[PDB]
């Protein structure tokens, strides 16, 4: 005769959704310079990790239903908003800018009237404005800033540093995170080597548009991950075994000068370039792009019926979708990517370093399509940044060849490569079994 | 609360049940984005433990890993014998099998504990 017996601590789990907090590395803040990401607030500092290898257990993983990616998108949108709430409103400067109009520079020098510290008086100021920000309104023709009909602009506070640093997402007691640990893990399917991990590996919050930078490379081969390999409206994310290196610089040094637009408010304007006027560029090695591009073509061949693969330059859109976009050191850039993504594999082998032109811009708009926007203040020194590209985002063209065009930016797709292997599963400790003992 | 040793059957895992407790310790004033998340996380853990300990306490086990309860086994809840329950069925599989009779089991355990409590007072007079 069996009798009911109760156990605490049995190995059982069910899927779940929870608030996962941020934990960061030992270094406080970011070496004492405040970040947009507020890493200093989020520092339940990371202790040595414990990982247990679940043995003989198989789990099913789908990466397009993960709630971990959805939480991150919201947290990053919010951290930027809290950072720019104290900063100056640039509403005084939505006035007619009379700029001199007519190799060529993008500067377009302009003149406008602006409010002084005393409310009654006014001043006339001159600033160098990139052609990308200013839109013609219909010598010395009138112009206006791009976001004067759809958005309120707020200057970035000068000291905050947009340096992306690793953020680890950790789970409260009673919940666990599970990592797939399987080579060439297609993202969606049954997974055999699951391990129980307390907190995610560091993810750099870097947002980029056509090429994924400073990411983590895949373990054994190039992997194509997409939500519906049949739809032409779903982006294809490619992950690379090995990295290609891109170095980007703005060669000509400029000056920043500050104008007082109100009581206590300063707008920093770009100044005349000392030294030689020069154009920004990004250097990618010719041999390396071609080898890695060649491998992406073979993988695309397998899932696409062995047709020839034609890569073409991006068709149209706002500047972000058409051009590679990234922040080098507080300065957003929008480089031309046609030389990189113009070829037919199924194969240019030119091996000379490829230099792609870059045009910078200063008024940046929220990707969601919401009304608000930001202005990024000028950076005084020459800027150089070195980076590794670990992925491409490509989207297929409308129905003997398939044409793939470079892809734009949904902030989420940047991190899907990073969080494909994690699932939060709740642990239910209690259990009842039939045993032979019998005594209350 | 353990993860790991989930693949093994009851006979293997139960021996290491001792180990689950054994090896390890076992088991904000800011309105920033990270600070509020930390507040919610703290409450979630405390609340969960207390719910689990409240459920354990009512049956009179009182914070012990293996608890024997004087409740006879009903053949409606299950059919398999001890060997084929404890030799080839994992804990997740079993808890999925008998997920339709957890509420009745809990109620029977509580009623049995209350009846045993009443029967004790009579002996003491």
């Amino acid at each position, epitope marked *: 005769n069996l009798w009911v017996t109760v156990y605490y601590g049995v190995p059982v789990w*069910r*899927d779940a959704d929870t608030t996962l907090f941020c934990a960061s590395d030992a270094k406080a803040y970011e070496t004492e310079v405040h970040n947009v990401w507020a890493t200093h607030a989020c520092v339940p500092t990371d202790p040595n990790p414990q990982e247990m290898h679940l043995k003989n257990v198989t789990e*099913n993983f*789908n990466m397009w239903k993960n709630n971990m990616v959805e939480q991150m998108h919201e947290d990053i949108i919010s951290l930027w908003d809290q950072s720019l709430k104290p900063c100056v409103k640039l509403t005084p400067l939505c006035v007619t800018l009379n700029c001199t109009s007519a190799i060529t520079d993008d500067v377009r020098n302009c003149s406008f009237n602006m409010t002084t510290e005393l409310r009654d008086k006014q001043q006339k100021v001159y600033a160098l404005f990139y052609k990308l920000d200013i839109v013609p309104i219909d010598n010395f023709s009138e112009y206006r800033l791009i976001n004067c009909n759809t958005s309120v602009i707020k200057q970035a506070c000068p000291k905050v540093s947009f340096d992306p640093i690793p953020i680890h997402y950790c789970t409260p007691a009673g919940y666990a995170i599970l990592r797939c640990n399987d080579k060439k893990f*297609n993202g*969606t*399917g*049954p997974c055999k080597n699951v391990s129980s991990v307390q907190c995610t590996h560091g993810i750099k919050p870097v947002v980029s548009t056509q090429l994924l930078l400073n990411g983590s490379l895949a373990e054994e081969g190039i992997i194509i991950r997409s939500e*519906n*390999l*049949t739809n032409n409206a779903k982006t294809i994310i490619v992950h690379f075994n090995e990295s290609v290196k891109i170095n980007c610089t703005r060669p000509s040094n400029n000056t920043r000068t500050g104008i007082h637009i109100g009581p206590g408010q300063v707008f920093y304007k770009t100044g005349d370039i000392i030294g030689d006027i020069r154009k920004a560029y990004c250097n990618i090695s010719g041999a390396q792009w071609h080898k890695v591009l060649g491998r992406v073509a073979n993988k695309l061949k397998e*899932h*696409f*019926n062995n*047709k020839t693969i034609v890569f073409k330059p991006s068709s149209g859109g706002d500047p972000e979708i058409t051009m590679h976009s990234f922040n080098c050191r507080g300065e957003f850039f929008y480089c031309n990517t046609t030389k990189l993504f113009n070829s037919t594999w199924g194969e240019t082998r030119d091996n000379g370093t490829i230099t792609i032109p870059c045009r910078i811009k200063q008024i940046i708009n929220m990707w969601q399509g919401v009304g608000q926007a930001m202005y990024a203040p000028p950076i005084k020194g020459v800027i150089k940044c070195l980076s590794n590209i670990t992925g491409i985002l490509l989207t297929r063209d409308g129905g003997n060849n*398939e044409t793939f065009r470079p892809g734009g930016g949904d902030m989420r797709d940047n991190w899907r490569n990073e969080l494909y292997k994690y699932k939060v599963v709740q642990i239910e400790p209690l259990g009842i079994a039939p045993t032979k003992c019998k005594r209350r | 609360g353990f993860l790991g040793a989930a693949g093994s059957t009851m006979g293997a895992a139960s021996i290491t049940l001792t180990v689950q407790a054994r090896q390890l310790l076992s088991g904000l004033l800011q309105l920033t984005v990270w600070g509020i998340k930390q507040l919610q996380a703290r409450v979630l853990a405390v609340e969960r433990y207390l719910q689990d300990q409240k459920f354990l306490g009512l049956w009179g086990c009182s914070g012990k890993i293996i608890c024997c309860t004087a409740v006879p086994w009903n*053949s*409606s*809840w*299950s*059919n398999k014998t001890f060997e084929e329950i404890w030799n080839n069925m994992t804990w*997740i*599989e079993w808890e*999925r*099998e*008998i*997920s*339709n009779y957890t509420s009745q089991i809990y109620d029977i355990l509580t009623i049995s504990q209350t009846q045993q409590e009443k029967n004790e007072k009579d002996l003491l007079e």
Partner: antibody, heavy 130, light 107 residues
Framework: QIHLVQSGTEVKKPGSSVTVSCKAY?????????VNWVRQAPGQSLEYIGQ??????????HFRGRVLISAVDLTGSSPPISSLEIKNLTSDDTAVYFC??????????????????????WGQGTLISV | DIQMTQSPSTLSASTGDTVRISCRAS???????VAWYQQRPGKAPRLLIY???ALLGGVPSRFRGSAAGTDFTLTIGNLQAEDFGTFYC?????????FGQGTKVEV
């Protein structure tokens, strides 16, 4: 949504082979799904043949050594496809056939149990007579 | 391996009358692994109830199931013309899956 389409009808003779293939519009992949082959009968109850589950083919004890099962999931142009082949065809094979799928993403739902599962979405069926 | 039988085998009923079709299994399905089907004439069967008494989405609520040991039953209250057809009873407990003998309900 979910929709199943199989091949057409065939009329054949004993000592031959015939295959029917189902094309599922709505199954993201067969890794977290499963295909169950079930053969209806001219007047009798439905029967079970075999299945592909985590790309592990199997068949019932009354069809072992004859029926073969294979499947290919999402491609560039085609949806997931699963196929059944009848070898050494006989008069008893005169019945409709179905290809069926049930979801396997969550263990706790109750639509599957240790590989023996229900039949959620049913195809139209292909009458085959010999 | 296991066998299942369903009775009443053929039934007659009018609109607005409760129907009691029962299912019996040789073994004891204590895990409540039973499913119900309802096919219209010349149509593929459709799942209606799984795990004894669980309803699918987009299905009329008049279908109800009861499960206790060996006796599995399905109750159709306030019958309509759309719900006539052939009903089935299957076990998903042990390999291979098995199906009920087959019951038809007619006007």
């Amino acid at each position: 949504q979910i929709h199943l389409v199989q091949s057409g009808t065939e009329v054949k003779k004993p000592g031959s082979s015939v295959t029917v293939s189902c094309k599922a519009y709505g199954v993201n992949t067969f890794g977290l799904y499963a295909v169950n082959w079930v053969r209806q009968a001219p007047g009798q109850s439905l029967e079970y043949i075999g299945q592909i589950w985590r790309w592990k083919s199997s068949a019932s004890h009354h069809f072992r050594g004859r029926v073969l099962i294979s499947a290919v999931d999402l491609t560039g142009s085609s949806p997931p496809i699963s196929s059944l082949e009848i070898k050494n065809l006989t008069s008893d094979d005169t019945a409709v056939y179905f290809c069926t799928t049930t979801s396997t993403y969550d263990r706790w739902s109750g639509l599957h149990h240790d590989g023996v599962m229900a039949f959620s979405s049913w195809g139209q069926g292909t009458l085959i007579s010999v | 391996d296991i066998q299942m039988t369903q009775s009443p085998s053929t039934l007659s009923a009018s609109t607005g009358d409760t129907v009691r079709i029962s299912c019996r299994a040789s073994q004891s399905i204590t895990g409540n692994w039973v499913a119900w089907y309802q096919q219209r004439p010349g149509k593929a069967p459709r799942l209606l109830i799984y795990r004894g008494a669980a309803l699918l989405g987009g299905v009329p609520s008049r279908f109800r199931g009861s499960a206790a040991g060996t006796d599995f039953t399905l109750t159709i209250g306030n019958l309509q013309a759309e719900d006539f057809g052939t009903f089935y009873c299957q076990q998903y407990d042990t390999y291979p899956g098995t199906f009920g003998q087959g019951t038809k309900v007619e006007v």
